[PDB]
From a paper:
Tetrahymena thermophila, a classic ciliate model organism, has been shown to possess tubular mitochondrial cristae and highly divergent electron transport chain involving four transmembrane protein complexes (I–IV). The energetically favorable oxidation of NADH or succinate by the electron transport chain (ETC) complexes I-IV (CI-CIV) first establishes a cross-membrane electrochemical gradient of protons, or the proton motive force (pmf), which is then utilized by the complex V (CV) to drive the synthesis of ATP1. Our findings demonstrate the structural divergence of T. thermophila ETC megacomplex in adaptation to the tubular morphology of its mitochondrial cristae.
Tt-MC IV2 + (I + III2 + II)2 is a ~8 MDa megacomplex encompassing the entire ETC of T. thermophila. Tt-CIV2 serves as a central coupler in this megacomplex, with each protomer associating one copy of Tt-SC I + III2 and one copy of Tt-CII. On the matrix side of IMM, ~200 residues on Tt-CIV2 COXTT2 N-terminal (NT), previously invisible in individual Tt-CIV2 structure, is now resolved as an all α-helical globular domain, fitting into a concave surface formed by the Tt-specific NT loop extension of NDUA3 and the C-terminal (CT) helix of NDUCA2 belonging to the γ carbonic anhydrase (γCA) domain. The third interaction site on the IMS involves COXTIM5 and COXTIM2 of the Tt-CIV2 small TIM hexamer domain bridging over to NDUTT12 and NDUTT6 of Tt-CI. In Tt-SC IV2 + I + III2 + II and Tt-MC IV2 + (I + III2 + II)2 however, both Rieske heads lack clear density, thereby likely capable of the swinging motion required for electron transfer towards cyt c. Taken together, structural symmetry between two Tt-CIII2 protomers that was broken in Tt-SC I + III2 is now re-established in Tt-MC IV2 + (I + III2 + II), suggesting the functional restoration of the electron pathway from the distal QP site to the proximal QN site.
Residue numbers in the entry:
A (entry chain 6A): 1 to 126
B (entry chain L): 29 to 222
C (entry chain I): 21 to 251
D (entry chain T): 2 to 157
E (entry chain M): 111 to 165
F (entry chain R): 2 to 173
G (entry chain Z): 4 to 90
H (entry chain C3): 496 to 594
The structure:
C-alpha cells in the first residue's frame, strides 16, 4: 500500500492549477494594490498562455498602465513604511538608555602613551 | 569589606542591648525561627510590614551598605511613584473638569450610583484620586516586599546564631573610624652577612 | 533477552549483565519458542479443531469450547517449550553432546550455582571499607602504583606502612578479609548474631557462579565448535 | 596524579619481543590507510576508524532523510507553487533572460525545483546531523590523544 | 607549477603562522616546534647533500 | 516477545524497586539517606537488624503494603457488581461468568494497588518519622545502595528461577 | 508472627514464593510496559493527589508537597526505567 | 562608512584562522556544521524561553552612589586582580564619605 | 565521606528533572482536558454504550497527556539511564576485589 | 530532543542560559591562573563552540532580516532590481535582529557546568562574576535560583547570615 502514497502523485502536482476563484469573488470597491496586482497577474498569465493576439496586445497595453499604477502604489507604500521605520528608529534611540559603561582598555596603550624606550630609540648605547 | 573584630563597634549589639525584653527580636535571639508566609492571604497581610521591617533594620544596621541602599531606593521610589500618582490625579481632575465644563463627560461609571446616588463625575474624581495610589502601593509592595523579606530572613538568621557584630559591608562615620598611622619608619639598612 | 543495557542501569558490571542476560534469555526464549510453535500449529490445525466435532460434538454447538481447546493447545506448546528450556533435564557432562540441548545441563548448573551461592550482604559496609573504596580510584591499573612513604601524612614507620599498604592494595586482599574489619563487623552486627543469623563478609560476586560457557562449573564445551579442551 | 613503578631497562629478549610486536603491528596496516610512521600513528588510525563509522552512520541517515523529508516536506512545499499570492495560476516572471518556457509546466516546475532542491538537501542534512550519534569519536577532555605504541598493542 | 609551489608555501608558511599567537600554558615549545618543523624542514633547503659530488 | 505476560511484573513499579542512582544524584544528604534506607528496607531487608525489619514492615503494611491491598480489594469488589454478568432464565453461563470475573477483578485490583502506591509511596518516604529515624540510625552509603541494588535484582531473578517447575520437578 | 517472616532461613530464601495460582491473578501487572497505561496511572494518581489535598484541608491527612524533591522524584520516576525483559 | 568595523570583521575570521589542520592531531575536532545545527536548535529553545518562560528581572539599585563598586570580602573569595587593594581602599573612603 | 556522583551528570539530571516535573503537571491537566473533550464528543455524536465511551475517553486523555509529556519523559529517561550506567560502572570499579 | 545529548556545546531546555554578549563579558573578569586544568579545558571547549556560534548567528538572522527588509520596502518583489533598498534596509535591520539574537540567552551544557559546579573553579567563577559583573551576576542568579540551584553567592539565599550584595527580584517562595 506504500506505493499508493509514494509512487502515485497528487493530480494538482502534475496538472496546471486553475484560478483560486475565492480570491476573485468578493473584491473591495477600491483601486488598491491588491486588486491592481490581481489584474496584472491575470493579464500576465493570459498573455503567457493564450494563443490569441489582439486580446494579448490589449492586455500588454493594460499591463503597462497597471505597471505604472502599481509603481505609484509601491511608491506610497515605500514612503510610508520607510518614514515610519526611520521615525521609530529615532524614537527608540531617544528612549533607549544607551550603555556608556564599556571597557576603555582599547583606548589606552601606556607603553605608547609614555614611550617606554625613552631616548633609547634615538641612537644606541655605544 | 571586613571590619576587624577589635575595630568592630558592635552598634547592632548596642541597639540589641537597648531593646525591650519583650521585643520579638530578642525572641529571635533565643531561636525563634522566621518562615516566609506561603499562603496568599498571609502574604497580603505581610505586604504592609515592609516599612516596619525597614525601620527596624535601619536602627539595627544603620551603616550597612545594602540596608542604606535599600532605604535610599525605597525612599526615592516612593517619592517618584507618589509624584507620578499625584500628577496623574491632577491631569485627570483637570481634564474631567475642563471637559465637563463643556458638557463632555466620559461614560465609564453609571450616571447615578446605587445607595447614596452619587454622580458619575464625583465617582470619577474619587477613582482617579484613589486608584493610582493603590497601584503605587501595589508596585512598591511587590518589589520591596520580596527585597525586605530576604533582608529580614537574613536578619533573623543572624540573630538566631547570636551574631551581634556588624555585617561585612558596614561603613562607619568618620567619628567611629580608626585613623591611619602615617609614621612608618623603615628598618635601618644593614649589609647582609651572607 | 534481558537488555544488557538495562542491567547495567542497575548495579551490574558488563560481564555480570551478560551472564544474567543469558540466563533470562534462555528462560524467555524457551517460552517464546513454545508460544511460536503453538501459534504456528493453530495456523495449520484450526481445521483439525473443526475436524474433532464428531468425537466431541460440544465443539460444534458450543464455539466457546473450541476457543478453550485452542487456548489449551497454545498453553500446551508453551509448557513444552518451558520444559525444554526451564526444566532441569539432567545430562552427562560430556564433550560430544554439550551445548546441543539434548539436556539442559548448562542452564540447570548455572541456575543451581546462582541460587545456592547467592546471599545478600546481610550488613552495611564499615567506614574502614568505605574509605578503602574511596581510595580504590583507578589504582588497579596494569602498572602497579609506586607507593612513596611520607612520615608527615602517613604516620607510623616506613616498615609498618609499606606492609600495610601492601596488604591494603598490592596483595589483592579485600577489605573484609582484614582482622580489624572482621572484628568491627562482628561487633556492629551483634544484634544480628543475637538472632543466630550469620554475617556475610564477601559481597556476592556474580562472575564466580554464572558463566555462559560453563567453564566455572567445568562443563566440557561442545567439541566440534571449540579448539581447546577443558578439565 | 600518582606515579607507577618504573621497570628496569629491558633485556635483549624483551627488546626482541617488542621489536616483533612492532613488526606485526606494522604488517597489519593496509596499503590504502595512508598514515605515516609517527608516535600518533595508532591514535590517528583509531580516530580515523571512529570517524569512518560516524561517516557511514551519517550518510545512511542522510539518505534516509532524503527519503523521508521529501514527501513529508518538499512535495507539499511544491503545492505552494500551484498559484501565486493573488490567486492567478503560476506564470513566469523573468529576471534578465526571457527564457522560452514553451513546455507545458516548464516555468512552475523549474521555479518549484529551484526552491525545493536546496530545501531538500538542507532538510536532509539537518536530519542527518540530528539523528546521527557522534559520541563514538567525541572526546570532551581530549583523553583519546594519548600516544599508543605498536608494541603495547600486541603481546608476544 | 608556480601555484602548486605557492599552495605549498601557503600550506606551511601562512596558515601555520596564524595558529599560535599567544603565550601557551601547556606544551608551548612542542606546538611551536611543530609549527616551525612543517616550514623549516622543506626538502628544497635540505635535499642538496644527497647529490653533493655534482658540485 | 510477550515477556509482559508470563514474567513477574508486579514488583517493578512499587516498593521502591524503581529507585536508582539518578534519584540519589539530586537528593540532599538527608533525602539521599531516606531514599537509600527505603530502597534497602523494602528490597533487601537482610541488611537491617530483625527489630528494625519488623518495625519497618509494620509501618510499610500500615501505610503502603496493606492499604494498597485493601484498596485493590475494594476495586475488585467494584468489579464484582452483578457477578452473573451473562445470565437468563433459560441459561446461566458458569464458565463464562467465572472467566469474566477472574479477568475483571484482578485487573481492577491491580489498578487500585498501583493508584494507592502512586499516591502514598512518595508521601510515606518523605514524611514518615519512623523511616526518618531509622535512616538517621543506619546512614547507608552509595556503596551500600549499589550493593543492595545488585542484591534486589538478583533476588527478583531468583524468585522466577525457583518457580520454574511448579508441576513436576523430580530433581533427577 | 511477623518476626517469623523476617527470620533469616536458608530454605525460606530459596523456596517458591509465587505459585501457579498467583500467575494469572497478577499477570495484569505487565500492562505497565505500555506508555498508555503508564499515562492512565499517572493521571489517576495526580487526580487522587488533588482529591487528597482538597480533603487534607481536614486535619489528620497530609496532602502532596510540591516542594519535596523525594515526592516529586518518586512520582515522576516510578516508570522511569521500566523494562519487562528483566527478572 | 562601515570601514572602521574591521576589528569586528577580524574577530570572527581571526578566530577561524587559528584553527589548525585536522590531521596534525592537535584536538581532532571539526565542529562547524554540527555547531551550526546545534546552535540553531539552541536558539529556538532560547527564544522560546525568552518569550514563554521565566525571564530574570533587570531592576537594580539606581540611587546609591558607587553601590556596585563591590570591594572584596568573604562573599567574593578575595580572588580579584592583585592591585585592586587600592580600589578597595578608594571604595571604603567613598562609602565613608557618602554615609 | 561518601561516594560523589559526577557533577555534569548531576546538572544534566537537574535540568531534565525540572523539565519533567513542569511538563508532568501541564500534561496531567492536558490529559484531564482531553478526557473531558473526548467524553463530550462521544456523548454528543457517537452512539455507543457508556462503558465504551468512558474507556475511549480515558484512553484518549492518557494519549494526549503522553503526547504532551513524551519529550520531557524521554529526555529524562535517557539522561537518567546514562547517569545510572556511569555511576554503576564507577561503583563496580571501586568495589571490585 | 536531538540524538547528541552528550555534546558539551549542546543543551536541553532547562540548562543554564547565557546570552553570547554576557559570555564575552564573563571572559573579561577571569584569569587562567586561578583555574584548574579542568576548568581551563571547559573554557577552551566553550570558546570553540562560542566562536563557531557567533560566526553562525548572523546567518540565522538573515531570513528574519530578509523578510523584515522586504516588508519595509513594500509589497513588491523587485528581485535583482530592488537590491539597493533591500540591502540598505538589511544593513540596518540585520544588526537589530542579531542584537536580539545575541542578547537572547541560550542553554548550553558548558554554561551549566562552568557556572554551576561544586569545585573551587566554579566557586571562583561565580565569585568573580558576582564582584566584577554585578548586573550579569544579578540576572544569572535570578535564573539559577529558579533552576533549583543553591549557592552561597546567589542573592536569593535564605540560609545566609550576610545581607545580599544586590537587589533581589520578586519571585515565588
Ligand atoms: C531408534 C528408533 C526410535 C527413535 C526415537 C526417538 C529418539 C530416541 C533416542 C533415545 C536414546 C536413549 C537416550 O536418550 O539415552 C539417554 C542417554 C543419557 O545420556 P545424556 O546425558 O543424554 O548424554 C549422552 C552423552 O553426552 C554422550 O553419550 P555417549 O558417550 O554414548 O555418546 C557419544 C557419541 C557417540 O560416540 C560414538 O558413537 C563413537 C563410538 C566409537 C567407537 C565405536 C565402536 C563400535 C560401536 C559403534 C556405536 C554403537 O555421541 C555423539 O556423538 C552424539 C552427539 C553428537 C552428534 C553430532 C553433532 C554435530 O544418552 C545416551 O544413551 C546416548 C545416546 C547417543 C545417541 C547418538 C550416538 C549414536 C550415533 C553416532 C553418530 C551420530 C552422528 C550421525
Ligand atoms: C562560515 C565559516 C565556515 C564554517 C564551517 C567550517 C568549515 C567546515 C568544518 C568541517 C565540518 C564538517 O565536515 O563537519 C562534519 C564532520 C563529520 O562529517 P561526516 O558526517 O563524517 O561526513 C564526512 C563527509 O566527508 C563530510 O560531510 P559534511 O557534513 O561536511 O558534508 C555534507 C553536508 C555539508 O553541509 C553543509 O555544507 C552545510 C551547509 C549549511 C551550513 C553552512 C555553514 C557551516 O551536506 C551536504 O553536502 C548537502 C547539502 C548541504 C547544504 C544545503 C543547501 C543546498 C546546497 C545544494 C544546492 C543545490 C546543488 C545542486 C543540486 O563533523 C565532525 O567530524 C565532528 C567531530 C567528530 C569527531 C570529534 C572528535 C573529538 C576529539 C577526539 C580526540 C581523539
Ligand atoms: C515569521 C515567519 C514564519 C514563516 C513564514 C513562511 C516562510 C517564509 C515565506 O515567505 O514562505 C513562502 C512560502 C510560499 O510562498 P511564496 O513562495 O511567497 O508563494 C509564491 C510562489 O510560491 C512562487 O514563489 P517564487 O518562486 O515566485 O518566489 C518565492 C520564493 C523566493 O525564494 C527565494 O528567492 C529563495 C530561494 C532559495 C534561497 C536559498 C538560500 O520564496 C520561497 O520559496 C520561500 C521559501 C523558501 C524555502 C527554501 C529556501 C532554501 C532553504 C535551504 C535550507 C534548508 C533547511 C536547512 C535546515 C533548517 C533546519 C531548521 O510559504 C510556505 O512555504 C508556507 C509553508 C510554511 C513555511 C515553509 C518555509 C520553507 C520550509
Ligand atoms: C493520539 C495520536 C498519536 C499520533 C502519533 C504520535 C507518535 C506515535 O505514537 O508514534 C508511534 C511510535 C513513536 O514511538 P515513541 O513515541 O518513542 O514510543 C511510543 C510507543 O512506541 C507506543 O506507545 P504505547 O506504549 O502506548 O503503545 C501503544 C499500545 C498501547 O497498548 C495498550 O494500551 C494495551 C492495550 C489496552 C489494555 C487496557 C486494559 C484492558 C483490561 C481488560 C480487562 C477485562 O497500543 C497498542 O498496542 C494498540 C492496540 C490497543 C488495543 C486496546 C484494546 C482495549 C480494549 O513510533 C514507533 O514506534 C516507530 C515509528 C512507527 C511508524 C513507522 C512508519 C514506517 C513507514 C515505512
Ligand atoms: C528588529 C527588526 C526591525 C523591527 C522594526 C521594523 C519591522 C517592520 C515590519 C513590517 O514592515 O511588517 C510589515 C507589516 C505589514 O504587512 P504587509 O506589508 O501587509 O505584508 C507584506 C507581505 O504582503 C507579506 O509578507 P511577505 O510574504 O512579503 O514576507 C516574506 C517573508 C516572510 O518572513 C517574515 O516576514 C519574517 C519576519 C517576520 C516578522 O519571507 C521570508 O523572510 C523568506 C526568506 C527567504 C530566504 C531564506 C534563506 C534561508 C533559508 C533557510 O507592517 C508594516 O508594514 C508596518 C511597518 C512599520 C515600520 C517600522 C515602525 C517602527 C519600528 C521601530
Ligand atoms: C551553495 C548553494 C546553496 C543553494 C543556493 C540556491 C541554489 C538555487 O538553485 O537557488 C535558486 C535561486 C535562483 O533564483 P530564485 O530564488 O529561483 O528566483 C526567485 C526570486 O526571483 C529570487 O529573487 P530574490 O530577491 O528573492 O533573491 C533571492 C534571495 C535568496 O536568499 C538567499 O539566497 C540567502 C542566502 C543566505 C541565507 C542565510 C544563510 C543560511 C541560513 C540557514 C539557517 C537558518 C534557517 C532559518 C532559521 C529560522 C528563521 C526564522 O537572495 C537575495 O536576495 C540575495 C542573495 C545574495 C547573497 C546575500 C547575502 C547572503 O538562487 C538564488 O536565488 C541564489 C541563492 C544564493 C545563495 C547563497 C548566497 C550567499 C550566502 C553566503
Amino acid at each position: 500500500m506504500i506505493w499508493k502514497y509514494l509512487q502515485r502523485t497528487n493530480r494538482g502536482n502534475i496538472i496546471q492549477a486553475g484560478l483560486q476563484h475565492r480570491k476573485f469573488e468578493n473584491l473591495p470597491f477600491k483601486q488598491n494594490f491588491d486588486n491592481l496586482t490581481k489584474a496584472y497577474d491575470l493579464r500576465m498569465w493570459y498573455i503567457s498562455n493564450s494563443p490569441h493576439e489582439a486580446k494579448n496586445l490589449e492586455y500588454v497595453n493594460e499591463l503597462e498602465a497597471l505597471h505604472n499604477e502599481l509603481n505609484y502604489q509601491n511608491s506610497r507604500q515605500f514612503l510610508f513604511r520607510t518614514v515610519s521605520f526611520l521615525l521609530g528608529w529615532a524614537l527608540f534611540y531617544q528612549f533607549y538608555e544607551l550603555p556608556k559603561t564599556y571597557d576603555w582598555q582599547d583606548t589606552q596603550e601606556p607603553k605608547h602613551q609614555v614611550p617606554a624606550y625613552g631616548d633609547l630609540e634615538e641612537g644606541g648605547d655605544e | 569589606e571586613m571590619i576587624l573584630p577589635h575595630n568592630n563597634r558592635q552598634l547592632a549589639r548596642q541597639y540589641f542591648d537597648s531593646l525591650p525584653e519583650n521585643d520579638i527580636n530578642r525572641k529571635y535571639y533565643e531561636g525563634l525561627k522566621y518562615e516566609t508566609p506561603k499562603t496568599f492571604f498571609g502574604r497580603f497581610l505581610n505586604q504592609f510590614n515592609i516599612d516596619a521591617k525597614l525601620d527596624t533594620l535601619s536602627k539595627f544596621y544603620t551603616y550597612q551598605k545594602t540596608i542604606r541602599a535599600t532605604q535610599a531606593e525605597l525612599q526615592e521610589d516612593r517619592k517618584s511613584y507618589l509624584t507620578n500618582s499625584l500628577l496623574f490625579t491632577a491631569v485627570s481632575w483637570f481634564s474631567i473638569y475642563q471637559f465637563a465644563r463643556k458638557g463632555a463627560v466620559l461614560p465609564v461609571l453609571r450616571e447615578y450610583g446605587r445607595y447614596f446616588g452619587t454622580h458619575r463625575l464625583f465617582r470619577q474624581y474619587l477613582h482617579t484620586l484613589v486608584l493610582p495610589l493603590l497601584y503605587t502601593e501595589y508596585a512598591l509592595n511587590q518589589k520591596y516586599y520580596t527585597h525586605m523579606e530576604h533582608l529580614w530572613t537574613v536578619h533573623v538568621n543572624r540573630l538566631n546564631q547570636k551574631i551581634l557584630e556588624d555585617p561585612l559591608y558596614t561603613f562607619y562615620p568618620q567619628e567611629l573610624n580608626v585613623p591611619k598611622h602615617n609614621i612608618i619608619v623603615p628598618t635601618i639598612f644593614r649589609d647582609t652577612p651572607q | 533477552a534481558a537488555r544488557v543495557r538495562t542491567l547495567i542501569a542497575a548495579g551490574f558490571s558488563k560481564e555480570e549483565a551478560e551472564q544474567v542476560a543469558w540466563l533470562q534469555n534462555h528462560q524467555v526464549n524457551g517460552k517464546i519458542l513454545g508460544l511460536f510453535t503453538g501459534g504456528f500449529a493453530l495456523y495449520c490445525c484450526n481445521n483439525y479443531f473443526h475436524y474433532f466435532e464428531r468425537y466431541f460434538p460440544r465443539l460444534r454447538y458450543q464455539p466457546f469450547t473450541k476457543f478453550l481447546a485452542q487456548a489449551a493447545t497454545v498453553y500446551f506448546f508453551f509448557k513444552i517449550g518451558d520444559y525444554y528450556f526451564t526444566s532441569r533435564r539432567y545430562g552427562s557432562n560430556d564433550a560430544r553432546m554439550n551445548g546441543l540441548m539434548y539436556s539442559n545441563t548448562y542452564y540447570s548448573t548455572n541456575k543451581e550455582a546462582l541460587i545456592q551461592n547467592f546471599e545478600p550482604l546481610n550488613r552495611k559496609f564499615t567506614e574502614e571499607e568505605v574509605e578503602q573504596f574511596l581510595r580504590n580510584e583507578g589504582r588497579s591499573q596494569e602498572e602497579k602504583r609506586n607507593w612513596i612513604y611520607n612520615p608527615h601524612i602517613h604516620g607510623s614507620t616506613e616498615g609498618e606502612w609499606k606492609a600495610d599498604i601492601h596488604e591494603k592494595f598490592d596483595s589483592g586482599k579485600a577489605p573484609w578479609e582484614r582482622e580489624h574489619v572482621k572484628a568491627k563487623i562482628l561487633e556492629t552486627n551483634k544484634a544480628k548474631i543475637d538472632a543466630g543469623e550469620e554475617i556475610q563478609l564477601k559481597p556476592f560476586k556474580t562472575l564466580n557462579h554464572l558463566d555462559k560457557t560453563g567453564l566455572l562449573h567445568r562443563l566440557h564445551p561442545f567439541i566440534w565448535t571449540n579448539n581447546w579442551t577443558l578439565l | 596524579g600518582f606515579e607507577t613503578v618504573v621497570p628496569a631497562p629491558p633485556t635483549r629478549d624483551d627488546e626482541l619481543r617488542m621489536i616483533k610486536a612492532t613488526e606485526e603491528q606494522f604488517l597489519q596496516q593496509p596499503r590504502y590507510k595512508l598514515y605515516m610512521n609517527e608516535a600518533h600513528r595508532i591514535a590517528k588510525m583509531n580516530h580515523g576508524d571512529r570517524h569512518n563509522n560516524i561517516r557511514a552512520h551519517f550518510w545512511s541517515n542522510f539518505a534516509l532523510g532524503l527519503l523521508i523529508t521529501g514527501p513529508i516536506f518538499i512535495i507539499p512545499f511544491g503545492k505552494a507553487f500551484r498559484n501565486l499570492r493573488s490567486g492567478v495560476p503560476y506564470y513566469f516572471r523573468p529576471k534578465y533572460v526571457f527564457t522560452q518556457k514553451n513546455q507545458y509546466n516548464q516555468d512552475r516546475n523549474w521555479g518549484a525545483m529551484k526552491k525545493q532542491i536546496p530545501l531538500w538537501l538542507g532538510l536532509s542534512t539537518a536530519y542527518a546531523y540530528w539523528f546521527t550519534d557522534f559520541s563514538i569519536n567525541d572526546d570532551e577532555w581530549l583523553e583519546k590523544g594519548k600516544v599508543i605504541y605498536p608494541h603495547q598493542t600486541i603481546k608476544v | 607549477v608556480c601555484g602548486i609551489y605557492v599552495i605549498h608555501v601557503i600550506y606551511n608558511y601562512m596558515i601555520p603562522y596564524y595558529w599560535v599567537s599567544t603565550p601557551l600554558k601547556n606544551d608551548e615549545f612542542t606546538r611551536l616546534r611543530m609549527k616551525d618543523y612543517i616550514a623549516s624542514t622543506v626538502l628544497e633547503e635540505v635535499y642538496g647533500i644527497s647529490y653533493a659530488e655534482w658540485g | 516477545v510477550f515477556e509482559f505476560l508470563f514474567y513477574n511484573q508486579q514488583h517493578k513499579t512499587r516498593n521502591g524497586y524503581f529507585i536508582n542512582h539518578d534519584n540519589l544524584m539530586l537528593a540532599s544528604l538527608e533525602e539521599r539517606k531516606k531514599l537509600i534506607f527505603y530502597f534497602i528496607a523494602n528490597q533487601v531487608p537482610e541488611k537491617l537488624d530483625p527489630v528494625d525489619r519488623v518495625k519497618f514492615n509494620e509501618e510499610l503494611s500500615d501505610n503502603l503494603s496493606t492499604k494498597a491491598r485493601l484498596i485493590g480489594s475494594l476495586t475488585g469488589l467494584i468489579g464484582l457488581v452483578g457477578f452473573p454478568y451473562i445470565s437468563t432464565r433459560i441459561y446461566s453461563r458458569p464458565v463464562l461468568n467465572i472467566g469474566l470475573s477472574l479477568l475483571i477483578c484482578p485487573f481492577l485490583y491491580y489498578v487500585g494497588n498501583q493508584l494507592t502506591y502512586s499516591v502514598w509511596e512518595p508521601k510515606f518516604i518523605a514524611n514518615n518519622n519512623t523511616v526518618c529515624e531509622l535512616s538517621k540510625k543506619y546512614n547507608f552509603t552509595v556503596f551500600d545502595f549499589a550493593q543492595a541494588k545488585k542484591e534486589a535484582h538478583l533476588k527478583a531473578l531468583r524468585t522466577e528461577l525457583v518457580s520454574d517447575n511448579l508441576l513436576y520437578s523430580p530433581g533427577i | 508472627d511477623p518476626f517469623k517472616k523476617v527470620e533469616r532461613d536458608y530454605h525460606n530464601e530459596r523456596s517458591v514464593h509465587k505459585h501457579f495460582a498467583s500467575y494469572p491473578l497478577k499477570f495484569w501487572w505487565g500492562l505497565n510496559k505500555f506508555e498508555t497505561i503508564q499515562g492512565i496511572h499517572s493521571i489517576l494518581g495526580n487526580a487522587a493527589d488533588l482529591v487528597v489535598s482538597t480533603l487534607s484541608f481536614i486535619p489528620g491527612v497530609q496532602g502532596r508537597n510540591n516542594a519535596s524533591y523525594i515526592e516529586n522524584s518518586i512520582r515522576v520516576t516510578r516508570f522511569r526505567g521500566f523494562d519487562d525483559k528483566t527478572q | 562608512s562601515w570601514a572602521y568595523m574591521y576589528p569586528w570583521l577580524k574577530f570572527i575570521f581571526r578566530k577561524y584562522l587559528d584553527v589548525p589542520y585536522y590531521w596534525f592531531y592537535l584536538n581532532g575536532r571539526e565542529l562547524g556544521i554540527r555547531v551550526f545545527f546545534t546552535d540553531l536548535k539552541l536558539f529556538f529553545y532560547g527564544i522560546t524561553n525568552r518569550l514563554f518562560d521565566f525571564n530574570p528581572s533587570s531592576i537594580k539599585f539606581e540611587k546609591y552612589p558607587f553601590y556596585y563598586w563591590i570591594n572584596s570580602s568573604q562573599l567574593t573569595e578575595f580572588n580579584q586582580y592583585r592591585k585592586f587593594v587600592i580600589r578597595d581602599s578608594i571604595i571604603y573612603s567613598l562609602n565613608n564619605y557618602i554615609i | 565521606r561518601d561516594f560523589e556522583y559526577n557533577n555534569q551528570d548531576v546538572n544534566q539530571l537537574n535540568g531534565a528533572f525540572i523539565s519533567l516535573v513542569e511538563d508532568e503537571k501541564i500534561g496531567f491537566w492536558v490529559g484531564v482536558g482531553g478526557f473531558a473533550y473526548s467524553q463530550f464528543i462521544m456523548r454528543k455524536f457517537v452512539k455507543s454504550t457508556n462503558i465504551f465511551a468512558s474507556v475511549t475517553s480515558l484512553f484518549a486523555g492518557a494519549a494526549l497527556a503522553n503526547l504532551y509529556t513524551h519529550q520531557s519523559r524521554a529526555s529524562y529517561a535517557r539522561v537518567a539511564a546514562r547517569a545510572n550506567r556511569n555511576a554503576s560502572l564507577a561503583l563496580n570499579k571501586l568495589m571490585e576485589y | 530532543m536531538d540524538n547528541n545529548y552528550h555534546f558539551w556545546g549542546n543543551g536541553d531546555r532547562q540548562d543554564v542560559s547565557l546570552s553570547y554578549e554576557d559570555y564575552y563579558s564573563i571572559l573579561d573578569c577571569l584569569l587562567d591562573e586561578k583555574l584548574s586544568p579542568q576548568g581551563l579545558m571547559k573554557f577552551k571547549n566553550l570558546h570553540e563552540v562560542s566562536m563557531y556560534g557567533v560566526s553562525y548567528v548572523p546567518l540565522y538572522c538573515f531570513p528574519v532580516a530578509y523578510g523584515i527588509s522586504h516588508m519595509l520596502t513594500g509589497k513588491v518583489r523587485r528581485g535583482h532590481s530592488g537590491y539597493r533598498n533591500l540591502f540598505s534596509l538589511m544593513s540596518v535591520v540585520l544588526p537589530f535582529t542579531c542584537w536580539y539574537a545575541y542578547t537572547t540567552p541560550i542553554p548550553r551544557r558548558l554554561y551549566t557546568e562552568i557556572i554551576c559546579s561544586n569545585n573551587a573553579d566554579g566557586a571562583y567563577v561565580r565569585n568573580r562574576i558576582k564582584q566584577q559583573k554585578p548586573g550579569i551576576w544579578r540576572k544569572l542568579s535570578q535564573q539559577l535560583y529558579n533552576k533549583n540551584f543553591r549557592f552561597p553567592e546567589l542573592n536569593q539565599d535564605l540560609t545566609a547570615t550576610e545581607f545580599p550584595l544586590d537587589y533581589v527580584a520578586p519571585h515565588k517562595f
